[PDB]
Structures are given as C-alpha cells and as structure tokens.
Amino acid sequence: EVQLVESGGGLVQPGGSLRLSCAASGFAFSTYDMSWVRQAPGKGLEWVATISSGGSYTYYLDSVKGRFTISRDSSKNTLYLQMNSLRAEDTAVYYCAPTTVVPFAYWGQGTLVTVSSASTKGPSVFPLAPSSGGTAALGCLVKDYFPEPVTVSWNSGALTSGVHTFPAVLQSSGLYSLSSVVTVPSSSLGTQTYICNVNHKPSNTKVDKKVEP
Amino acid sequence: DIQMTQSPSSLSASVGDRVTITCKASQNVRTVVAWYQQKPGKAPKTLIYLASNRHTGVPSRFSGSGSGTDFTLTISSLQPEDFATYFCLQHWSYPLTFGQGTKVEIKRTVAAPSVFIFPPSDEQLKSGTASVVCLLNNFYPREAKVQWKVDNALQSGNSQESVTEQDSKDSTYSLSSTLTLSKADYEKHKVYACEVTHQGLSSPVTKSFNRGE
C-alpha cells in the first residue's frame, strides 16, 4: 500500500527557510515523477513543482522559481522541497504525490507551512461543564494559541460518538481558539469520567482536563 | 496560462440525486484532465484520470467524460459521505492547473438544533477574561441566527461563530457561538442568554443562565 509521509512544515518567519520531506514506500518510487501540490487555508489546490522519475527535469510554479528546489533521493525513497525566501502566500498545506498513470495518484496527509513573524503561543484548556437537566453536553474550550493546529481527544480517544471539535477561529488578538464538545446520557455523569486530551504539537503542549460543576 | 473553470462552484443535493460538475479548459487540453475529491482538512483522493477513467478503488457512481475544452464529473447517485470539494486538473501543459473546486453539500430534511449554553469556568475567570459558549447541536440547514443578550441587550462584535463539517451519516451541522467579555464586565451582569433562530424551530429558542445559580 502506498505511504507518503510528509514532514518539515512548521512556523517560519517571512524571508526564512524550511525543507519539506516526503518519505514514500509501497511503490516503485524512482520509477515515477513526484510533485508537490499545496493548498493555502480556505483555498484550492495549487501545483508547486514536479521532478521527473530520474531526477533530471524539474518544473516549478512561476511564483516559486528561484526560491524553491524540488529534489529526490533514490536511496531513501524521499522527495524534498527546499523552500527559501518565504512570503505570506507560501502559507499552505504541502502534499507530495507520485504521478503514475494519473498525476497525483496518491497523496500524503500534508505538512503545514505557516509563514508569520508571530510567535508560538500555547493554549489554555477550560471546561464546558454540564449541569432538571435532560441529557446534556459538556466539553472543553481551547483558547489563545498560535500557530494552528491543535488536536482534541476525548478519554484518550475512547470517547468518539457525538464529539464535535469545532474548527479554529482566529480572534482579534491574532490567536486561535476552538471548542470540542460531546453529548452524553445524564446518567453517565455521576459515574463516568470525562477528560479532553488537548495537544498543541507546535508548542509540544499536552493538556488533559476533566469536566463538571 | 491554462485556466480551468469549474461550475458550479458549490451545490446542494440530496442523497440519491445525480450530481454533475463541469470544468472548462481555457483551451484545448485534449483529454489530459483528472478529478480529485477532497473532504475538508484531509488529503485529496484521486477519482478520474484522462477524463474518463476510474482510478483504483473509486466507487462506480463516480465517472468522468469530456474532451478538448469541456469536462464532466458525475456522481450518479449521491451518498451522504460524498460531501467534499471536487477539483479538476489539466496537465496537458505546465504549469499544471486545478479548477477552483466545486463544494458539494448534502441536502437533507430540516433538523432542529439542540441548544446549550456554558458559563465561563471559574478556572478562567481566575484569569481576567470570560468566554460564554452557546452550542447548536446537530441541525440542518447550516444557516442559523445566534443572538447574544446580556441582561437582555443584543450584543455586537463580541461574538464569533464556528461551524463543523457535515456529519458523514446524518448530514447535520453543529455550531458554536462564543461571547467574550472582561472578568470585570461579565460580573457587572446577571442573565446570559443566547437566542437561536433556525428553520426547524417555530419560534426562536433561548437558553439562559444567571451568573449566580
């Protein structure tokens, strides 16, 4: 089965540099053209660059000529993107994808490049506490973080049903915030324990928080 | 530069509907057109290549046709998991160019939200800021009016909404409205109300709490 493991994305200041890598397995890597395709948040897919199977022809989006270099290592089955002179329009999720009979036959899960001079700030995790109730809800607020993203889990991932983790909203302060909530039987409350497992890898922060009044 | 123009740009359609999506190439790209499906916040999945061919694993309700300048993706019978943005791609010529995407929404019967309100935690008032949250759980359609009143006075701009993606089974949405006020300012007032106006409610529904009780 095709695996495409991107990494190297992260926060970088304008004019800075990042190198992305794309670790491929399960297909004859060096037989195929490889591409980077990116997507700025809220926007569509944009082709960044392609390198031929043998490494010898490279094609670049005009926007990136002279700043990005696509390259590949046959002995590590890895595709690279050395990105310099980074500007705000480079903010995007970067995917790598082989071309087989079809361009972009398979896609990695992406790596997020955020080009900003703002500083990594980690979140706070606050209960949304339950409760004449009916069968009510609870959750956690994840407030004031940068950059995107945080993951939220319930009961270390044992709680899956009726969870809604809302997309992050950018506040006036320039910081992000979101809530994850879950619905549950009113019974369950006295006996079952509810903790949200918040992770903000951009800060390596990792908060696990129980809820109720 | 070869433009790919998709129409429509979004569309709402019921389970079982036949959905067609077009894509016009700025000039003759012959049959060198592919189609991709992207669920929000996830890697694209390749659907169609060379205009009419089904990539491996993709269900047979998906199909493509077209030539030259004009291209079609059909989902013969929409399933509730098929909400996504769909992109066409020419690769007749570099730069490789995607269409702008067609967001496909699942139309379903009206579903009234379940509303909940969450006072800020003391865990947070201990911190000078205050977040009141109002949750609209599992409704359809997306459009809703969340109005915040404090001691009954409609608020402005101290509010922010976020909406989840469509549920893969029952196609509903959930929504959170966040109200932000000072520690000082939250505690100059008593009754906190968010009022919800939705197609599925005869009258607007209010959920309240007094800062005391």
Largest interface: A-B, 43 and 48 residues
Cα-based radius of gyration of chain B, to the nearest Å? 23 Å
User: In oligomeric terms, what are we looking at?
Assistant: heterodimer
Q: What is the CATH-assigned architecture of the largest domain in chain A? A: Sandwich
Helix content percent band of chain A:
under 10%
Largest sheet of chain B: 7 strands, mixed
CATH level-3 fold name of the largest domain in chain B: Immunoglobulin-like
How many domains of chain B? The number is 2
SSE string of chain B, helix = H, strand = E? EEEEEEEEEEEEHEEEEHEE
* Number of individual domains of chain A: 2
Q: End-to-end span of chain B in angstroms?
A: 64 Å
Number of helices of chain A: 1
CATH superfamily of the largest domain in chain A: Immunoglobulins
Instruction: Choose one word for the global shape of chain B.
Output: elongated
Strand segment count of chain B: 18
| Amount of beta strand of chain A | over 45%
CATH level 1 name of the largest domain in chain B: Mainly Beta
Coarse morphology of chain A: elongated
Total beta strand runs of chain A: 18
What is the CA-CA span between the terminal residues of chain A? Answer: 48 Å
Please supply descriptive tags for the structure shown above.
heterodimer, A: 213 residues, mainly beta, Immunoglobulin-like, 2 domains, 6-stranded mixed beta sheet, 5-stranded antiparallel beta sheet, 1 helix, B: mainly beta, 7-stranded mixed beta sheet, 2 helices, 18 strands, elongated, immune system
What this model shows, in words?
The complex is a heterodimer of chains A (213) and B (213). By secondary structure, chain A is mostly beta strands. Chain A has two domains: 3-115, Immunoglobulin-like, CATH 2.60.40.10; 124-210, Sandwich (Immunoglobulin-like), CATH 2.60.40. In chain A, 2% of the residues lie in helices and 46% in strands. Chain A contains one helix and 18 strands. Chain A has a six-stranded mixed beta sheet with strand order 2-10-9-4-5-6, with no helix packed on it. In chain A, strands 11, 12, 14, 15 and 16 form a five-stranded antiparallel beta sheet that branches. Chain A starts with a strand and ends with a strand. With 213 residues, chain B is mainly β. Chain B folds into two domains: 4-107, Immunoglobulins (Immunoglobulin-like, Sandwich), CATH 2.60.40.10; 114-210, Immunoglobulin-like (Sandwich), CATH 2.60.40. Chain B is 4% helix and 50% strand. In chain B, strands 2, 4, 5, 6, 9, 10 and 11 form a seven-stranded mixed beta sheet that branches. Chains A and B meet through strand 5, strand 11, strand 12 and strand 16 of A and strand 4, strand 5, strand 9, strand 10 and strand 12 of B. It is classed as immune system. The entry lists the keywords Human A33 Fab, immune system. The assembly is dimeric. The entry is titled "The structure of the humanised A33 Fab C226S variant, an immunotherapy candidate for colorectal cancer". Chain A is A33 Fab heavy chain.
